[PDB]
Design a protein around this motif. Sequence first.
Motif, PDB file in Angstrom:
ATOM      1  N   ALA A  51      34.050  10.535  66.312  1.00 26.14           N
ATOM      2  CA  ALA A  51      33.464  10.455  64.996  1.00 26.14           C
ATOM      3  C   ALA A  51      34.308   9.537  64.105  1.00 26.14           C
ATOM      4  O   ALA A  51      33.765   8.759  63.335  1.00 26.14           O
ATOM      5  CB  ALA A  51      33.317  11.799  64.308  1.00 26.14           C
ATOM      6  N   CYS A  77      32.994   5.708  62.554  1.00 20.14           N
ATOM      7  CA  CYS A  77      33.217   5.346  61.160  1.00 20.14           C
ATOM      8  C   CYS A  77      34.084   4.087  61.032  1.00 20.14           C
ATOM      9  O   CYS A  77      33.835   3.186  60.203  1.00 20.14           O
ATOM     10  CB  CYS A  77      33.834   6.553  60.455  1.00 20.14           C
ATOM     11  SG  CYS A  77      34.247   6.370  58.706  1.00 20.14           S
ATOM     12  N   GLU A  78      35.146   4.052  61.834  1.00 21.57           N
ATOM     13  CA  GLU A  78      36.097   2.934  61.723  1.00 21.57           C
ATOM     14  C   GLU A  78      35.684   1.670  62.433  1.00 21.57           C
ATOM     15  O   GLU A  78      36.051   0.558  61.998  1.00 21.57           O
ATOM     16  CB  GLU A  78      37.458   3.333  62.350  1.00 21.57           C
ATOM     17  CG  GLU A  78      38.224   4.386  61.544  1.00 21.57           C
ATOM     18  CD  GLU A  78      38.722   3.921  60.193  1.00 21.57           C
ATOM     19  OE1 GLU A  78      38.623   2.700  59.853  1.00 21.57           O
ATOM     20  OE2 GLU A  78      39.207   4.848  59.487  1.00 21.57           O
ATOM     21  N   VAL A  95      38.787   8.462  54.510  1.00 20.69           N
ATOM     22  CA  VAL A  95      37.340   8.612  54.582  1.00 20.69           C
ATOM     23  C   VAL A  95      36.911   8.937  56.001  1.00 20.69           C
ATOM     24  O   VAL A  95      36.183   9.931  56.216  1.00 20.69           O
ATOM     25  CB  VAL A  95      36.600   7.344  54.090  1.00 20.69           C
ATOM     26  CG1 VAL A  95      35.110   7.516  54.356  1.00 20.69           C
ATOM     27  CG2 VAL A  95      36.895   7.105  52.613  1.00 20.69           C
ATOM     28  N   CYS A  96      37.350   8.166  57.018  1.00 22.79           N
ATOM     29  CA  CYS A  96      36.753   8.448  58.341  1.00 22.79           C
ATOM     30  C   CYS A  96      37.198   9.764  58.903  1.00 22.79           C
ATOM     31  O   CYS A  96      36.397  10.372  59.669  1.00 22.79           O
ATOM     32  CB  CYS A  96      37.043   7.287  59.326  1.00 22.79           C
ATOM     33  SG  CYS A  96      36.200   5.756  58.772  1.00 22.79           S
ATOM     34  N   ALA A 104      37.462  12.457  57.149  1.00 19.18           N
ATOM     35  CA  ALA A 104      36.519  13.340  56.471  1.00 19.18           C
ATOM     36  C   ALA A 104      35.167  13.309  57.162  1.00 19.18           C
ATOM     37  O   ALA A 104      34.551  14.376  57.347  1.00 19.18           O
ATOM     38  CB  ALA A 104      36.424  12.963  54.996  1.00 19.18           C
ATOM     39  N   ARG A 105      34.708  12.133  57.567  1.00 18.87           N
ATOM     40  CA  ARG A 105      33.411  11.989  58.253  1.00 18.87           C
ATOM     41  C   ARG A 105      33.440  12.772  59.560  1.00 18.87           C
ATOM     42  O   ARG A 105      32.408  13.239  60.091  1.00 18.87           O
ATOM     43  CB  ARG A 105      33.046  10.477  58.346  1.00 18.87           C
ATOM     44  N   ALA A 106      34.584  13.020  60.188  1.00 18.56           N
ATOM     45  CA  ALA A 106      34.762  13.719  61.441  1.00 18.56           C
ATOM     46  C   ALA A 106      34.970  15.212  61.183  1.00 18.56           C
ATOM     47  O   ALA A 106      35.093  15.968  62.136  1.00 18.56           O
ATOM     48  CB  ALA A 106      35.937  13.166  62.241  1.00 18.56           C
TER      49      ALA A 106
END
Length: 81
Positions: free
Chosen positions: A6, A10-11, A73-74, A76-78
């Motif tokens: 995840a 994002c990255e 941010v990424c 958090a997305r995970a």
Amino acid sequence: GSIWDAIAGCEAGGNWAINTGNGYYGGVQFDQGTWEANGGLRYAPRADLATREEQIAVAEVTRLRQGWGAWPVCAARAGAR
């Protein structure tokens, strides 16, 4: 799968070999200093030249030393922040 997939979506759009020239490399967008400081040269010259599993191994060390907030941010997305 791993939680890192995840982060890599994002990255890097899930491409762990990305090397776009932006100062960051591979699926979780390490900079070179972080790659080297967390043991990455044992696997490959840069993160994008290492396999997903090797990048994840270095990312685990990096997360332990520096926190999930290194990917503010990424991670958090995970679901990790």
